[PDB]
Design a protein that fits this description.
The structure is a homodecamer of 40-residue chains.
Chain A (H helix, E strand, L loop, with lengths): L1 E18 L9 E2 L2 E3 L5
Organism (chains A, B, C, D, E, F, G, H, I, J): Homo sapiens
Family (chains A, B, C, D, E, F, G, H, I, J): Belongs to the prion family.
Subcellular location (chains A, B, C, D, E, F, G, H, I, J): Cell membrane; Golgi apparatus
């Protein structure tokens, strides 16, 4: 029995926020997640 | 028995928020997720 | 018995929000997800 | 017995929101999902 | 017995929202999903 | 003057090749492209 | 003057090739393209 | 004058090649590209 | 004059190659590229 | 004059190669690239 499981080459997560004009009284929220496969 | 399971080449998640004009009294929310396959 | 399961080449999820004019008193919400196949 | 199951080449999900004129007192909501095939 | 099941080349889902004129007091909601075939 | 040009929500291109039976002395070639609109 | 041009929600291009029986001495070629509108 | 040009939410390109049976004396070539809009 | 140009949320490119059966005397070549918009 | 150009949230490129059966006398080549927009 041979097993190869739960792999990925490259994974990247991020966010870019830019304040250049206007007022921006609110918010700029970002929550990007990456989850692989869990074994049971 | 040979097994190859739950793989992906490249996975990327993110968001770009740009404030250049207007007021932006509200919000800019982003939640992108990536989940692979879980074993049971 | 040979098995090859739950794979994908490349997967990407994200959102771009741009404030350039108007007021934007509301919101700009985005939740894009990607889920692979789970084993039972 | 040979098995090849639940694969896809490339999968991408996202949204683009642009505020350039008007007021936008409301919302711009987007929830695009992609789910592969689950095994039972 | 040989099996090849639940595959697709490329799958993409998203939405583009543009505020350029008018008031937009309402909403712009989009929920596009893509689901493959599940095994039982 | 206000301008919004050359946008798309999500774009994905790929190919899946599976060798499970037969001989496959030939080839399996795939070249899928996606090009947006160019400005002049 | 207000302008909104050359947009699409989601665009995907791909191909699936499966070798399961026979000989396949020939080829399986696929070239699907997607081009948006160009400005002049 | 306000300008918003050449954007996309998420873009992904890839290929999955699987050798499980047969001989595969040939090839499995894939070249998927994605190009945005160029300014002149 | 305000300018917002050549953006994307998330971009991912990759390939998965799996040798599980058969001989694979040939090749498994993949070259997926992603190019944004160039300014002139 | 305000300028925001050539941005992306997250970008990832990679490849996964798995040798589990067969002979693999050939090759498994992958060259995925990602290029942003160049200014002139």
């Amino acid at each position: 029995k041979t097993n190869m499981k739960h792999m990925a080459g490259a994974a990247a997560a991020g966010a870019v926020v830019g304040g250049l004009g206007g007022y921006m009284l609110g918010s700029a929220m970002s929550r990007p997640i990456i989850h692989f496969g869990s074994d049971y």
